[PDB]
Amino acid sequence: GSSGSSGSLENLATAPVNQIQETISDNCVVIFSKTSCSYCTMAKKLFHDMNVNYKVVELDLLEYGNQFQDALYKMTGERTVPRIFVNGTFIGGATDTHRLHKEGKLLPLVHQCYLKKSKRKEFQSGPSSG
Template sequence: MGNSASVTTDLSNTATANHIKDAISDNCVVIFSKTTCSYCNMAKKLFQDMNVNYTAIELDRYENGSQFQDVLHQMTGSRTVPRIFINGTFVGGATDTQRLHREGKLLPLVHQCLIQRGGGSRQPCSLP
C-alpha cells in the first residue's frame, strides 16, 4: 500500500538517469555543476582557457537537481559537484581535472572524443 511513492521515485530516478546518460553520450565534455560552486567555476574556466567546448548542466537551476545528484552519486560514488565526464567516462571533480591537465592527459582525452565523433562535438543538450 505504501509502495506508490517508491515506484514513482524509481521511475523518476530512471528518467533522470536516462537524461544524464544521454547528456554524457551526446557530448564530449559534460560538467554537472552548480552556478554558485567555486570548484565548478574553476573547472569550467579550465576548459574555457583551453578553448574546449563543454556542456554544463547547472543542477541548482533544475527543480529536481537533488535527484540528479542522487543518480550521479550512484554512478560516481559522490554527490559533490562538479562531476566531470569526458568521452563518456567520469574523470572526477575540479581538482582531479586540474591534475589531469597538469599531467598533460586532459587534452588528449578531449581530442580522442573529437576524433571519434568526426572532428566536432555536438551542440549542448537541453534537459527538462
C-alpha cells in the first residue's frame, strides 16, 4: 500500500491489457493467478488431472504484477484468483471452471483453440509492409 504522490501515470499506447489479449489469442489456455490465494492450486489440479496442457502465470512474483492485475480485473469485472481464460473469454474462475468440466461446458472449448489451425483455404488477418 502506498499513499500520497498518487493519481498520475505515464501515458503510453502499450497498455498491459493489450499484451494479454494477444497471449490468450495465441495460446489455448491461460491461468492468471497469484501466490496469495489457495484456489490458485485448484485450477492447476483441475487441468493437470485432465492432462490438458495449461499455462499458468504468477503475477504476485511478477515485478509488473500490479499492472497486468488491473487490466484483467477489467476484462473480467472482478479481482479474484486464480483466473482461467479460454478463447479470450473469462469462462470463470477456479470454482466455475471446475463446474464446467463436470457439465462438459469446458471441454467443448478446449478442443477448439487447437482445432481449425491446420493450413487450409482461409483468409486470415496478417501484417505486411514490403
